[PDB]
C-alpha cells in the first residue's frame, strides 16, 4: 500500500526494540520482530527506520491486542537521521501505528508529530496525522 | 525389500537345492511354464524360435515370471490364444542364501538363510522356446 | 482477428513441428531422429501438442 520510494533513513530500531503505539486501538507498546523488505545478512539484526513497515508483537495493551502479532509503521524515532537537503533531525520517542498490508490504519487518530518520510510513504497516515514534521 | 539383482548374478558355489537339508525355502514366483495352446498337434505349428543365453549367470525366479507374463500379454493380443505355444525351459532349482545383519550383532560367525531361488544357466543354453 | 490465410503461415512456423521425447528440442515434421547430440540422437518423437478449446 506504500506509495513511491524512500530516501536513506538510518535505522535506529532493531529487533526486540520496544516502541510506542500512537493509535487509539488500546495497544500501548509493540516490540519489533522483523522488518518487511529487510534483506538478510549473517548475524545481522533486522533494522527499521521512519516509514518502515515492521512486524511487531504487542506485549502491553487490551486483551484483544496483547500477545499477538500485528503490522505497524514507524512514524518517529529517537535516532538522528539526515534529510537530503542537509537537515539533521530526531524525535523524542520511538512510536508506531498499526496498519495492515493494504496500508490503511486500524485506528482513527494519531497522537504526536509524524515524520514526513512516513507521511509521504503512506497516504492514510498523513491524513490522520496532527502535524507532519 | 529385495536385494539388488547384481548381488546374486554370478554362478558361485555348489548347487544348493531344496531338500531335507535345506528348509524354510519360500515358494518360487513362477509356477506356470507352458503357456498358450499346450495341446496343439505337432503339425499345426511348424515354426520355432529360441532365447539363447550367452552368459553363465544366475537367473532369478522373478525374472522368469516377469518374462512369462510379458510374452503372455503380448502374444494373446497379437496371435490370439490358440495360435502359439511357449514353453519356459529353465526351472528355479537352486536356492540362494542371505546373511541378514541387524552393534549387538555378531560380526562374521553366521551362515546365510534362504533368500529365494534362481536357475543356474550357462553359455548357449536355451531359455525360452515357442512355436507358432 | 487473424484471417485463416495468415493463420497457416503462423502455425507452421510455431506449431507444426515434432518434439523429441529426450532432447525436448524442436524438430521438423518429417524427421525420424532426435537431431541434438545430447539426447543421443534418439528415435522416438512426438508431435507438438495442438492448442484446443
Amino acid at each position: 500500500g506504500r506509495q513511491g520510494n524512500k530516501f536513506r533513513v538510518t535505522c535506529g530500531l532493531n529487533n526486540a526494540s520496544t516502541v510506542n503505539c500512537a493509535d487509539n486501538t488500546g495497544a500501548k507498546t509493540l516490540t519489533i520482530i522483523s522488518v518487511k523488505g529487510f534483506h538478510g545478512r549473517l548475524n545481522r539484526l533486522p533494522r527499521a527506520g521512519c516509514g518502515d513497515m515492521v512486524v511487531a508483537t504487542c506485549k502491553k495493551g487490551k486483551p484483544e491486542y496483547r500477545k499477538k502479532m500485528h503490522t505497524a509503521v514507524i512514524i518517529r524515532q529517537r535516532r538522528t537521521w539526515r534529510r537530503k537537503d542537509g537537515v539533521t533531525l530526531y524525535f523524542e520517542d520511538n512510536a508506531a501505528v498499526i496498519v495492515n498490508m493494504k496500508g490503511e490504519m486500524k485506528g482513527s487518530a494519531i497522537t504526536g508529530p509524524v515524520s514526513k518520510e512516513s507521511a509521504d510513504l503512506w497516504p492514510k497516515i498523513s491524513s490522520n496525522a496532527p502535524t507532519i514534521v | 525389500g529385495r536385494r539388488p539383482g547384481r548381488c546374486y548374478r554370478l554362478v558361485r558355489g555348489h548347487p544348493y537345492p531344496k531338500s531335507k537339508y535345506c528348509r524354510g525355502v519360500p515358494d518360487p514366483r513362477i509356477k506356470l511354464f507352458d503357456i498358450g495352446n499346450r495341446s496343439a498337434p505337432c503339425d499345426d505349428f511348424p515354426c520355432c524360435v529360441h532365447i539363447v543365453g550367452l552368459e553363465r549367470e544366475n537367473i532369478s525366479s522373478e525374472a522368469m515370471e516377469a518374462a512369462r507374463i510379458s510374452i503372455n500379454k503380448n502374444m494373446l493380443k497379437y496371435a490370439g490364444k490358440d495360435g502359439f505355444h511357449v514353453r519356459i525351459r529353465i526351472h528355479p532349482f537352486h536356492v540362494l542364501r542371505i546373511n541378514k545383519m541387524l552393534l549387538q550383532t555378531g560380526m562374521r560367525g553366521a551362515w546365510g538363510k534362504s533368500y529365494g531361488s534362481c536357475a543356474r544357466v550357462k553359455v548357449g543354453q536355451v531359455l525360452i522356446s515357442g512355436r507358432c | 482477428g487473424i484471417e485463416p490465410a495468415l493463420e497457416a503461415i503462423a502455425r507452421k512456423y510455431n506449431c507444426d513441428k515434432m518434439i523429441c521425447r529426450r532432447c525436448y528440442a524442436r524438430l521438423p515434421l518429417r524427421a525420424t531422429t532426435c537431431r541434438k547430440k545430447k539426447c543421443g540422437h534418439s528415435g522416438d518423437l512426438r508431435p507438438k501438442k495442438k492448442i484446443q478449446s
Partner: protein
C-alpha cells in the same frame, strides 16, 4: 563407400560470365556481380564444354569434380554446385522474400529508411522497445502492401538470412506461442523476374 569420381555440372546461360581463380568463382550477369569462395581442399572447379542433354548440343558448364573420397566429403560436390546455380540465378533473376506481419490486437507499424538498408518494427505486441534490424549489403527492403514487405537482392544467402533476422527479432517470450501467434513470417520465396 569411397567413390572413384563424383561430379556435378551447372549450365551457364548466355548473359552470365564466370571466372575461376583457385576455388573462387565470380559470376557476372545483367543484374550485377557475385563473388564467393569455396574453401574445400578436395574439389576441383573448372569450366568446360559438356553435353548434358540426352540429345542436345555442347554448352558451357562449370564442372565441380572430386576424386576418391568418402561419403562425408563427397556430399560437398552437389552443395557447391547448388551454390553456383543459385549465384547464376541471383544475377539473372534476383531473389525476393515476401514477409507478412501477423498481429492479433496491437497493430505493428513498419518504418523503412529512405534508401532501404534498414527497417523499424514498432508496437509489436504493445512493446515500447523498438526493433531496428539492419540489412546486409546488397539486400533492400520495401513495402509491398499492408503488413507485407519484400527483401530484394542478388545473393540468396544474404536475402534469406536478412529475412530471418527480421523474424528472429520479433519473438514472443515467456508466453504461449500457440496462442500469441505474432511476428513477421516469410509467406513465400520467389524470383523477381
Amino acid at each position: 563407400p569411397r567413390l572413384l569420381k563424383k561430379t556435378e555440372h551447372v549450365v551457364i546461360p548466355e548473359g552470365v560470365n564466370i571466372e575461376i581463380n583457385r576455388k573462387n568463382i565470380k559470376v557476372t550477369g545483367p543484374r550485377g556481380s557475385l563473388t564467393r569462395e569455396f574453401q574445400h581442399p578436395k574439389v576441383d572447379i573448372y569450366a568446360s564444354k559438356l553435353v548434358v542433354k540426352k540429345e542436345g548440343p555442347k554448352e558451357n558448364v562449370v564442372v565441380i569434380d572430386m576424386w576418391y573420397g568418402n561419403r562425408r566429403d563427397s556430399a560437398v560436390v552437389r552443395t557447391i554446385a547448388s551454390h553456383i546455380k543459385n549465384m547464376i540465378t541471383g544475377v539473372t533473376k534476383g531473389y525476393q522474400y515476401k514477409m507478412r506481419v501477423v498481429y492479433a490486437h496491437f497493430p505493428v507499424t513498419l518504418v523503412i529508411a529512405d534508401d532501404g538498408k534498414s527497417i523499424q518494427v514498432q508496437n509489436f505486441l504493445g512493446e515500447k522497445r523498438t526493433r531496428h534490424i539492419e540489412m546486409y549489403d546488397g539486400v533492400v527492403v520495401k513495402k509491398l502492401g499492408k503488413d507485407e514487405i519484400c527483401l530484394e537482392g542478388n545473393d540468396v544467402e544474404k536475402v534469406s538470412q536478412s529475412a530471418a533476422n527480421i523474424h528472429a527479432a520479433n519473438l514472443v517470450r515467456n508466453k504461449d506461442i500457440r496462442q500469441f501467434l505474432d511476428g513477421v513470417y516469410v509467406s513465400e520465396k520467389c524470383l523477381i523476374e
